[PDB]
Point group: C2
Chain length 329, copies 2
């Protein structure tokens, strides 16, 4: 008699028990992404679905699941959902706002420090067993007195600026919408154009929203404008950086380093899409620092994201209007 | 011509050029520490020596260098030098000011972020070639809302608190001498006793000033007072942490992780000293993050340390009292 809820990815045990009171839960007991054909097979008979980044909810999917009443996305964005198809199928579509902002900002700063201070090579030198004390090796670039530019001053850009404000750097940003005077003073951040940003910075951090004019914002033309010996940190999205232009800039000496949490191969919304991370990047351990999309990979934050998606599902199944709904079926 | 200067370790080419105007320079072209016998072979007819952390200047060394007039240490301390033997042999011994504060504070925060966000294991997964997109793995621990305590509040601890002030944490500290009230308010850092710090902190950062080093400040008793699942970050000095006690606390689950830039095996002035970093720490890549004494490994600080040591040698060779002298020959 109970409705069934399918969760496409692993969630904390507490979240399953929370949903259990009002629904029969079909969980993913592994840490892997199930093939789409297996997700659809489990959801065919489901009244609710918790969706994650690798899910692509199109009309084809909805047509296979005629009982669906709510998709609770454990996500802030909904680029992978055909919203109006959900509406036409009578399916609530809900999202979770804002929770990824701060952990993404903290990770971006972690990537900056790990890359500029050669910390990965440093750890490999320790694990080798040959550490016998200080050596004149792995001299990096410090933060204080340097110029860092944030391209895009949305929620994550503001979180980064607030955190770097204590580091005695020269902080620049560009955005079509300026911060107010109170914010610029509190964080000591100076508005410039994008061309000025690229001209002046030792460190360039893109954090722009998704748009057509965002594709390869950092291309060969942009890298040519940047300071020789600068560093680029990308925890925004794979499509904002031309990874092949980065490879060329690392080889020529234009870039001293590239760090990334995100990769072009992730974009399943694109046709000119690579299938792996370029080998020239994977091989270049001296100049790169990578993480596998860990921007929100904080246990406490993931639990609260799953909790919000679960509450949205419970609310919708109870005939309420879900707190994170973006449509109205 | 004319006086000869031996540099025991590699220095930036501009330092070579600076010394060359008044001296014939015998550089270490490698990033390795020379064996003692080779240093003596170079210095036997040198007028000046630039010394670094791995050097050890005793009476026996000086007896083999009858022309030596000055040893310029590229170091803020002089533990490794028999100062009175220098004096007796007519040799100036000079040091440089402490310039390590800010890059050590920056590295400590990099260690904290790298450790808590599983960034090394993340990089290993990217380089494995098997990344296929976001997955519910490598969930770490966040900063915002958590409690971090700095044990000791000297120059480096103040630098850390200033930088963490923007991270929306609960910052605690303990020190026999309080910060002034404007700093406690500006950084939102609260003074507690050591026992209260250990009890309340998710993150513990020993950073005692030079005047207050305690052997094994963090030992089995301290770790038993800490929160289960806490993290410990040591960029202060090898001797302040009982590494065998840390190994046991990682094994029991008391500590979720340990990161360090310094190691007990470095203490060449203590007698109960080990020769290698313990194997159980080196093997534990899941729960540790290590760097090979990189606290001040930033080009700008290394360059300034070398410059001041060279200027001291230049002054002493010209018959002046060098600015960084610690003795009177």
């Amino acid at each position: 008699m109970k409705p069934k809820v399918v969760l496409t990815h692993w969630v904390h045990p507490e979240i399953i028990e929370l949903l259990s009171a009002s629904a029969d839960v079909i969980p993913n007991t592994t840490r892997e992404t199930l093939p789409r054909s297996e997700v659809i097979a489990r959801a065919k008979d489901a009244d609710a679905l918790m969706a994650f980044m690798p899910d692509s909810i199109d009309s084809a999917f909805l047509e296979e699941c005629p009982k669906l009443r709510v998709i609770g996305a454990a996500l802030k964005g909904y680029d992978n959902f055909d919203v109006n198809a959900c509406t036409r199928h009578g399916v609530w579509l809900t999202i979770v706002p804002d929770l990824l902002t701060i952990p993404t900002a903290e990770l971006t700063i972690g990537l900056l420090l790990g890359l500029t201070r050669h910390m990965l090579e440093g750890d490999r030198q320790i694990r080798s067993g040959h550490f016998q004390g200080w050596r004149p090796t792995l001299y990096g670039s410090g933060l204080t007195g340097k110029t860092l530019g944030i391209i895009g001053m949305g929620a994550v850009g503001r979180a980064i600026a607030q955190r770097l404000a204590g580091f005695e750097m020269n902080l620049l940003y560009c955005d079509p919408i300026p911060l107010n005077a109170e914010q610029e003073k509190a964080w000591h951040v100076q508005r410039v154009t994008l061309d000025e940003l690229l001209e002046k910075c030792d460190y360039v951090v893109p954090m722009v929203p998704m748009a057509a004019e965002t594709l390869h914002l950092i291309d060969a033309t942009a890298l040519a404008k940047m300071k020789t010996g600068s560093y680029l940190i990308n925890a925004c999205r794979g499509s904002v950086v031309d990874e092949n232009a980065v490879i060329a800039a690392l080889a020529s000496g234009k870039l001293a380093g590239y760090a990334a949490d995100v990769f072009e191969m992730e974009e399943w919304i694109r046709a000119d899409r690579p299938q792996a991370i370029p080998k020239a990047l994977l091989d270049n351990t001296a100049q790169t620092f990578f993480t596998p999309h860990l921007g929100s990979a904080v246990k406490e934050v993931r639990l609260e994201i799953e909790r919000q998606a679960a509450m949205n599902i419970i609310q919708a199944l109870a005939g309420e209007k879900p707190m994170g709904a973006i449509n109205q079926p």
